[PDB]
Structures are given as C-alpha cells and as structure tokens.
C-alpha cells in the first residue's frame, strides 16, 4: 500500500493514548487562564 | 441635501453636452453610427 | 419560485436548524482551544 | 498591507501545451469521449450541467490534472464505473487548469477528486486522498457508496428532502466573486 | 430652451428619464454614495478599491496596531508559514515528494501522519548529525542562508549533470541503458542475464545503448536504487558523507511512500513521465522538449549492434569520454556558477 | 563544447519569470455583455508566493533527483565524472 | 560542557518524541472520530486566496435585485415603462400633508 510504510510507525502505548485522550500538551489550561485574564484586563 | 447637490451638478454637467446621451459605461448598448467606418 | 410542493415549512425549518447547528459545530471544531472552551462554557455558565 | 501582482505571461499562457510523442519502442515496457462520460472544456458547459442536469439527475465529476499519476491510474476504473452507472447518473471529466472556476466551485484542493453532486448543494460529497493511503479502487468504492446514498435520499420522501442549501442565497459569491456578473449585480 | 441654471432642478429631472435611473441607482439603492456628479467614474472606482484594500489590510494584518490579531496561540496556515520559514520549506518538500504535485496545490494544513513522519525523519537526521559532531567536531579541540546556498548549488549541479547527459543522449533513456565502458556493459548485461540487444549511433553519440527484455524492462524501487549507487561507490572507494547518505535514504523513503506506481504509469516511459510532471511555466520546458524530440527521432532510426562489436568500440568511447570528463572541469568555469567553479577548484 | 550545447541552452534561460511569483489568473469581462466573464490562467490553492518565489526551483530539482535515481538504478556510473571533478561531497 | 549541552539536546528531543507520540494518539483517537464531514463548511474563500486566483471583486456596496432595474442604464430608450413613469410621477415631492397626519 502507499502509506503503510508511514502508518506502521504510528503505534502507541497505553499511557501514550491515555495522555492523548486527556490532552496534556494540547489543552493548556494555563493558556486558557492567561487568555481569560488578558480579556478581562482589556475592559 | 447630498442628493440635491448631486442632481444640481448632474444638471449643469450633463444636460448641455451633446456627448452624453447616457453614461459612457453603457455605450456598448447604443446603436451604431452609420457615419463611422 | 418560492416553496416546493409536497414539502412543509416545518420541514424547511428543520432543514435550516440542522444547517445552523452543523455550521456551529464546524466553527467550534475549527477554533482555538485556548479561547473557545472558556468563551463558550465557563463565562456563559 | 498585502498585495499580489496581477499576472504574468507565463501564468496566462496555455496551461496544457503539447509535448513530443515517442515512437512505438518506448511504449514497449514490462507493464504494458469513451461513449459513457463527458469531457468538460468550458465553464458555460459546467454551469449548464450543475444548474440543470444536476437538478434533474445526479452527476459524478472527476477533477484531475496532467502532472498527477494518481489521476492516470484512476481514469480507467472511473471510466468503468461510468459505463456501469451512467443510467442513474451523468459523468463528467474536468481538468483543473483548463477549467479552474469549476474547481473553485466544487471546493477541490487536491487532485484526483471525485465529486458527487445533486441539486448543486442538496447532495455534495467530495472523495479524495489528502494523506496518500487510499487507492483507486477505494476511491471508486466510496464513489459508488455516495451515489447509492444520494439516489436513496432522492427516492426518500416523494422526491423531496433534496433541496439546495446555502447556494439558494449565496450564489457561490464568497467562493468565486465572479458570480456577481452572472447575477447581474453592479461592480462599480 | 431656457438657461439651464434658470431652469428648476426638479423640472429638469422630471423631464429626464435616464438620469433619474442614475440617481436611483446611487441615491435610492444606496445610502453612502458620495454626492458627486459621477460616482461610476474611474477615479471613484479606484478610490473605492484602494479604500477596500487598505481597510481589509488594517483589519486583518499582523501589525503594530492590530485589530483582529489578538489572543493568538494556535495560528492559521498563512501566518504560521509566514513566521516559521523553516517549516514552510520542510512541509513543502515533503508534499512534493510524498505526492508528486505542484506548489499551487499545497494543502492549507498538512496531515498529522505527514507531520509525525517528518518528526521521525528529523530524529534520524539529528541523531546521525549529532553523533558525528560529538565524535569528530570536538576531538579537534543563520540556517536560512545556508539552506538557500545548499539547495541552489544542488539544483545547479543536477542541471549541469542533466545537460552533460543530454549532450550524448544519455539523460532520460529508458528502457534503454547507456554504456561508456565494457565494465558497465557487463554490469548492465547481468541485469537481463545476457539477453536483450545493443544499439549504436555513429560517433556523435559517445555511448552505446542496451535494451533488456520486455519482462525485465521495469523500473526499480528508489531504495534499491540508492543501495545500488552507494554499494558501487564504496566498491570504487568513494563513499558519500553520512549526512548526505541519510538525505538520500530519507528521499528514497518518502518516494517509497508513494506506493506501487511511484514514478510511472503502466504503459508509460520515464521520458513521458518527466514531460508529464514537468512544470509548464519552467524556462527549460522548450529545452527539454527539444531534447526529447531529437532523442525520439534519433532512437527511431538507431542501428542495432551486437555485443562484441561494441567492446572494441567501448574502449575508444571510454577514452574520449574520460577526455570529455577532463574537459568538463574547465567547461564549468565557462558558464557554471561561482559555486561550481570554486568547488571544481 | 557541443556536449555542453545543453549547458549553454540552460544558461540562456536563467531569470525568466514564472507563475510562482504572481497570481495564477485574471478575470476579463466581455464589454458588450458585462454579465459574461472569463478567467484566464491556471488553478491555484496557494497564496504564499512571497515565500515560494525563492524556492520555485525545488519542484524541478526534485524531479531531476527522482530521474537521476531512476537512471542510476540501471547504471550508477553516470555520476563518476562529477565525483572525479570533486563537485559532490565525497571522502576519497 | 559539551557533554552536558549534548545530553540536554538529547532529552529535549526525547520529550519531543513523547509529545509526538501523544499527538498521534490524540489525533487518531479523538480528532479523526470527531472531524466534521464538510457539508456545513464555510461557504466562502479568503480574500488572499481569491486575490491569488484572480477572482476577487471589491465593488458594489449596493445591488439591483431585478433585471428590469439592472438594465435601465443600458436600455437608453425605456429606462421606465409608461405605467412605471406615471407611477413615479406621483412622488415628485414629499407629502407634508401625510407627514402632518
């Protein structure tokens, strides 16, 4: 297949997929708080 | 008042030209001159 | 040609609401994670 | 401040020039109209299709480009699908560089692309491989599934349930602003 | 008529039915048009266009006075690639190789699969480069410009090689295989196991071509190609540098990602594939068309020549070919760039 | 010299402009029928011309690489002239 | 120093590997399942892409809905029908009587 060579490299751990489900480095509640703070300060 | 001024200028600048039978952007729709060739 | 035969204005309303909700889902999906969750859930709540 | 220069002689030149053809020895390799489709050459024809034929019975459009090898691989099975299912739908063959306004209309970003259309927005399904994992048979299977789906949905509820959507009032003006001329609106 | 400045304005407009439509168009159907005699004139139109463009730029652009650029943590495609020029190049080279395509079809956002593969290749390259540096750079004791120079020199090099081969019609000849020596003759005859034919052109073509059998007229995978090249180079005793070898290997990998048909269609030849994928805006388009026309019309009438007739010919071909290769170094000073010249010196 | 005919041919066409530095299309309205409008040019989903104008060569460069690879899979001895000339990075 | 900065880079990219693995997992679990179809996509194209396509139009803050109203300045001979003319003749002035009432 065309993309099987690349899609064979994509095999994850249980902890990897739990961390992705939770979105550790992709939700960023500190960034959300910074946005809220800046938005309220902009009043 | 804006409309009044616009029409008051249109009068002076269009009504005595002999060159503006309509607007120049629509001259394609006019009939053709028999004198031009 | 306004309206079509065999179709109801309520069916058209359902169509429109479906369109609006799908568009809202698309716009929420294609948005910043930093801002959208806050502005859509935590300030409204 | 953002600007793009208007165009160049290269850009406005013929996108599809002829190239030399080999003798019948290079063709000898280890790996060695159509009466069922319609090659589209003109946005007039494309609009006629989309606004009348796609309202009568569905259409399936293959958007390709010459540089792509996936298009060359997908052409023949697409022609077989057309020969199979031309009774239920119409089949069109579009080159993006020859008719770009048709590609902007269908919202195609990669080639090759299948597009199933009915009512110009009542059913629009785009099938493609942006990643590079699928194959031609997969694409044709997806196209068959989409055609079955749209046919079923047209049969559903006495012919209704397939009405145009945002094109009822947009006229594809945000996608391609040149439709204001078609609608006869001013541009001054 | 009376004097028009004596005439009442509303009476003139009641008399005139055409400029009525002109006023309705601009003053009944709109509320913001200027009160000038000619709102449709080119000055007004162009002023409106420039105001439009300035407004949209001031609103959307990233500036010192930003209206809409605010609360930015996840950037869109355009702004991302405008700020990170390193990633536009990497994301663009991957797109052209993983999918043989034009820059005009560059996707707005790449797939996560492509991004992950890119990160894996980055692992490979950074691993090799870092470990090489660790060993050699320490026992001793602006990346944009460097990348531009590297890519410019490389494309210049490949252009020069293509011109050199087109000089003797060896540039893109398949299923033919060119030969300039009996060693290469034996090497490429081992492909078809002695089967096939050999063809010649008289003393303007400084090489002899070999046709394998139709079952063995296939193209090889790019990883196999790279392995063959490198093995030949180490057998001759001229190995590439490890960074360049890794570059070749990753290029072969992303070409393998294309799948079964990675370069050619079933009934297609490599010259036809090149002319197909060749950019039509390219300056060398007519040059390549010239070359392939001449090559086709020559190979149509090329004569057949059996095996032993060539080897005695291949000796003198080897001689004059090494003489031409010696001349090539001086010929690069003729028209090649300063990079090629200084690297030849 | 006549072998470098093609080098001369390439060096002839060096700085000719392309579609990668400009917009790929332009609209023209029929003056007799302003409702009718034609788009002269190509397709494009690309707007980073102010960057791509510098790397415009990469497409044909990578094409040349893929073709040199195809030729070398059959005969790897075509590059030996450049190796002997010392243009490539090699460790003799 | 060399040792330490080299190993620093080493586990920098270790953390990068971890990030990439969790990125892949996040995508292929959540986002490929939650991706929108594309039926309800945005019905427009950005002005920069239109400008590169040669497609953008800037003008006509106003419009003319009906073709009768569009072709007025091109007809040159009947900008208004006779019935329309007599109907327009009723509004040469504003009605102060109606305003007052």
Short mmCIF file of C-alpha atoms in Angstrom, two decimals, chain D:
data_model
loop_
_atom_site.label_atom_id
_atom_site.label_comp_id
_atom_site.label_asym_id
_atom_site.label_seq_id
_atom_site.Cartn_x
_atom_site.Cartn_y
_atom_site.Cartn_z
CA UNK D 1 -0.67 45.93 3.52
CA UNK D 2 -1.00 42.84 1.33
CA UNK D 3 -0.82 42.62 -2.46
CA UNK D 4 -0.17 40.14 -5.25
CA UNK D 5 1.00 41.25 -8.72
CA UNK D 6 -1.78 40.90 -11.27
CA UNK D 7 -0.38 38.15 -13.51
CA UNK D 8 2.41 37.16 -15.91
CA UNK D 9 2.65 35.99 -19.50
CA UNK D 10 3.73 32.61 -18.12
CA UNK D 11 0.68 32.32 -15.86
CA UNK D 12 -1.68 33.47 -18.64
CA UNK D 13 -0.04 31.19 -21.23
CA UNK D 14 -1.60 27.91 -22.32
CA UNK D 15 -1.50 25.60 -19.26
CA UNK D 16 -1.85 22.46 -21.44
CA UNK D 17 0.64 22.60 -24.32
CA UNK D 18 1.62 19.62 -26.45
CA UNK D 19 4.81 17.64 -25.83
CA UNK D 20 6.69 15.26 -28.13
CA UNK D 21 5.35 11.73 -28.52
CA UNK D 22 7.67 8.70 -28.58
CA UNK D 23 7.97 6.00 -31.25
CA UNK D 24 6.47 2.55 -30.65
CA UNK D 25 9.53 1.24 -28.81
CA UNK D 26 9.39 3.31 -25.62
CA UNK D 27 5.79 2.14 -25.25
CA UNK D 28 7.04 -1.47 -25.16
CA UNK D 29 7.56 -1.88 -21.41
CA UNK D 30 7.09 -4.72 -18.94
CA UNK D 31 3.96 -3.06 -17.52
CA UNK D 32 2.12 -2.68 -20.85
CA UNK D 33 -15.28 10.66 -25.31
CA UNK D 34 -15.34 7.00 -24.22
CA UNK D 35 -19.09 6.80 -25.00
CA UNK D 36 -20.06 7.00 -21.30
CA UNK D 37 -18.65 10.28 -19.91
CA UNK D 38 -18.32 13.92 -20.95
CA UNK D 39 -15.05 15.84 -21.03
CA UNK D 40 -15.78 19.41 -19.92
CA UNK D 41 -13.90 22.28 -21.57
CA UNK D 42 -15.94 25.36 -20.63
CA UNK D 43 -17.39 26.94 -17.50
CA UNK D 44 -20.53 27.64 -19.55
CA UNK D 45 -20.98 23.89 -20.00
CA UNK D 46 -20.09 23.29 -16.35
CA UNK D 47 -22.73 25.78 -15.18
CA UNK D 48 -25.35 24.35 -17.54
CA UNK D 49 -24.60 20.90 -16.11
CA UNK D 50 -24.60 21.97 -12.47
CA UNK D 51 -27.76 24.08 -12.70
CA UNK D 52 -29.93 21.84 -14.92
CA UNK D 53 -28.61 18.27 -15.16
CA UNK D 54 -27.60 18.11 -11.50
CA UNK D 55 -31.17 19.14 -10.65
CA UNK D 56 -32.65 16.51 -12.98
CA UNK D 57 -30.41 13.56 -12.04
CA UNK D 58 -27.13 13.39 -10.10
CA UNK D 59 -23.69 13.96 -11.57
CA UNK D 60 -20.27 12.49 -10.78
CA UNK D 61 -17.31 14.69 -11.69
CA UNK D 62 -13.67 13.60 -11.77
CA UNK D 63 -11.29 16.54 -11.35
CA UNK D 64 -7.77 15.65 -12.49
CA UNK D 65 -4.53 17.24 -13.63
CA UNK D 66 -1.94 16.01 -16.10
CA UNK D 67 1.04 16.04 -13.72
CA UNK D 68 -0.66 13.61 -11.33
CA UNK D 69 -0.06 9.88 -11.69
CA UNK D 70 -2.98 9.01 -9.41
CA UNK D 71 -5.27 10.61 -11.99
CA UNK D 72 -3.82 8.41 -14.72
CA UNK D 73 -4.27 5.34 -12.52
CA UNK D 74 -7.83 6.33 -11.57
CA UNK D 75 -9.03 7.26 -15.06
CA UNK D 76 -9.74 3.78 -16.41
CA UNK D 77 -11.62 2.46 -13.34
CA UNK D 78 -13.54 5.75 -13.34
CA UNK D 79 -14.49 5.05 -16.95
CA UNK D 80 -15.64 1.56 -15.97
CA UNK D 81 -17.74 3.00 -13.15
CA UNK D 82 -19.23 5.44 -15.66
CA UNK D 83 -20.03 2.65 -18.12
CA UNK D 84 -21.65 0.77 -15.24
CA UNK D 85 -23.75 3.54 -13.71
CA UNK D 86 -24.41 6.06 -16.50
CA UNK D 87 -28.08 5.01 -16.47
CA UNK D 88 -28.59 6.51 -13.00
CA UNK D 89 -26.22 9.49 -13.17
CA UNK D 90 -24.19 11.67 -15.52
CA UNK D 91 -20.39 11.54 -15.57
CA UNK D 92 -18.01 14.43 -16.22
CA UNK D 93 -14.24 14.78 -16.64
CA UNK D 94 -12.69 18.12 -15.66
CA UNK D 95 -9.12 19.40 -15.79
CA UNK D 96 -8.38 21.93 -13.06
CA UNK D 97 -6.01 24.06 -15.15
CA UNK D 98 -8.39 24.11 -18.13
CA UNK D 99 -11.50 24.95 -16.08
CA UNK D 100 -10.39 26.38 -12.71
CA UNK D 101 -13.71 28.08 -11.96
CA UNK D 102 -15.25 24.61 -11.89
CA UNK D 103 -12.60 23.52 -9.38
CA UNK D 104 -13.18 26.57 -7.19
CA UNK D 105 -16.92 25.86 -7.33
CA UNK D 106 -16.61 22.24 -6.17
CA UNK D 107 -14.10 23.21 -3.44
CA UNK D 108 -11.42 20.75 -4.62
CA UNK D 109 -7.98 21.27 -3.08
CA UNK D 110 -6.15 18.15 -4.29
CA UNK D 111 -6.22 16.00 -7.44
CA UNK D 112 -7.60 13.50 -8.32
CA UNK D 113 -11.00 14.23 -6.77
CA UNK D 114 -14.42 12.61 -7.15
CA UNK D 115 -17.43 14.86 -6.60
CA UNK D 116 -21.00 13.54 -6.37
CA UNK D 117 -23.48 16.38 -6.91
CA UNK D 118 -27.27 16.68 -6.84
CA UNK D 119 -29.23 19.94 -6.77
CA UNK D 120 -25.91 21.85 -6.69
CA UNK D 121 -25.96 21.67 -2.91
CA UNK D 122 -28.68 19.16 -1.94
CA UNK D 123 -26.03 16.42 -2.06
CA UNK D 124 -22.35 17.29 -2.49
CA UNK D 125 -19.84 14.61 -1.49
CA UNK D 126 -16.13 15.03 -2.21
CA UNK D 127 -13.94 11.91 -2.24
CA UNK D 128 -10.16 12.24 -2.27
CA UNK D 129 -6.95 11.08 -0.56
CA UNK D 130 -5.24 14.06 1.08
CA UNK D 131 -2.95 11.71 3.03
CA UNK D 132 -1.85 9.15 0.43
CA UNK D 133 -3.19 5.91 1.90
CA UNK D 134 -6.20 5.02 -0.25
CA UNK D 135 -6.13 3.60 -3.79
CA UNK D 136 -8.18 3.94 -6.96
CA UNK D 137 -10.43 1.01 -6.05
CA UNK D 138 -11.07 2.56 -2.64
CA UNK D 139 -11.99 5.87 -4.27
CA UNK D 140 -14.35 4.17 -6.73
CA UNK D 141 -15.96 2.18 -3.91
CA UNK D 142 -16.53 5.39 -1.96
CA UNK D 143 -18.00 6.99 -5.08
CA UNK D 144 -20.37 4.05 -5.59
CA UNK D 145 -21.44 4.28 -1.95
CA UNK D 146 -22.07 8.02 -2.27
CA UNK D 147 -24.06 7.55 -5.48
CA UNK D 148 -26.19 4.86 -3.82
CA UNK D 149 -26.72 7.15 -0.83
CA UNK D 150 -27.80 10.15 -2.90
CA UNK D 151 -30.09 8.03 -5.07
CA UNK D 152 -31.72 6.54 -1.97
CA UNK D 153 -32.13 10.01 -0.48
CA UNK D 154 -33.72 11.35 -3.67
CA UNK D 155 -36.17 8.44 -3.64
CA UNK D 156 -36.82 9.15 0.05
CA UNK D 157 -39.97 11.16 0.81
CA UNK D 158 -41.66 11.54 -2.55
CA UNK D 159 -38.73 13.12 -4.38
CA UNK D 160 -38.24 15.90 -1.82
CA UNK D 161 -35.68 16.03 1.04
CA UNK D 162 -33.01 17.15 -1.50
CA UNK D 163 -33.32 20.94 -1.67
CA UNK D 164 -30.44 23.37 -2.29
CA UNK D 165 -28.85 24.93 0.76
CA UNK D 166 -26.61 27.96 1.07
CA UNK D 167 -26.45 28.41 -2.71
CA UNK D 168 -30.12 29.42 -2.51
CA UNK D 169 -28.89 32.85 -1.38
CA UNK D 170 -25.07 32.84 -1.71
CA UNK D 171 -24.80 32.03 -5.43
CA UNK D 172 -21.22 30.89 -4.73
CA UNK D 173 -20.18 34.52 -4.41
CA UNK D 174 -17.92 34.06 -1.38
CA UNK D 175 -16.26 31.13 -3.14
CA UNK D 176 -15.93 32.88 -6.52
CA UNK D 177 -16.84 36.57 -6.61
CA UNK D 178 -17.29 36.49 -10.40
CA UNK D 179 -20.88 35.24 -9.95
CA UNK D 180 -22.00 38.84 -9.35
CA UNK D 181 -21.73 39.31 -13.12
CA UNK D 182 -23.89 36.23 -13.67
CA UNK D 183 -26.45 37.62 -11.22
CA UNK D 184 -26.24 40.98 -12.99
CA UNK D 185 -25.25 42.94 -9.90
CA UNK D 186 -23.17 46.12 -10.29
CA UNK D 187 -19.45 46.15 -9.59
CA UNK D 188 -18.92 49.91 -9.53
#
